[PDB]
Amino acid sequence: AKQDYYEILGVSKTAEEREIRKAYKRLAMKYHPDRNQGDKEAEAKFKEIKEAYEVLTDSQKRAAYDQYGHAAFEQ
Structure with missing residues (x-):
């Protein structure tokens, strides 16, 4: 019911974007194809x-999950 875009990076549960950026930075370089x-x-x-980080700065995806997947904010 959406993916856990906090775990996909892997940060202190649902830390502010403040720390998500830090997860995203380590993980992005780790998982770079190069x-x-x-x-x-x-x-x-x-x-x-990336998707994870990006949802974590979005509007609806970012909240519907957080409440209840997609039985929260389907208006």
Whole structure:
């Protein structure tokens, strides 16, 4: 019911974007392909970790989950 965009990076539960940026920074470099092509999914993992960060600055995705997945803010 949406993904846990806090765990996908992996930070102190649901820490402010203040610390999420810090998770995102470590994890982004860790999961950067940097010629680890062919694998392809590891970059996709960086895509998820980006997605996570990005949802964590968004509006609706960011709250509906936090309350209740998508039975919160479907108006």
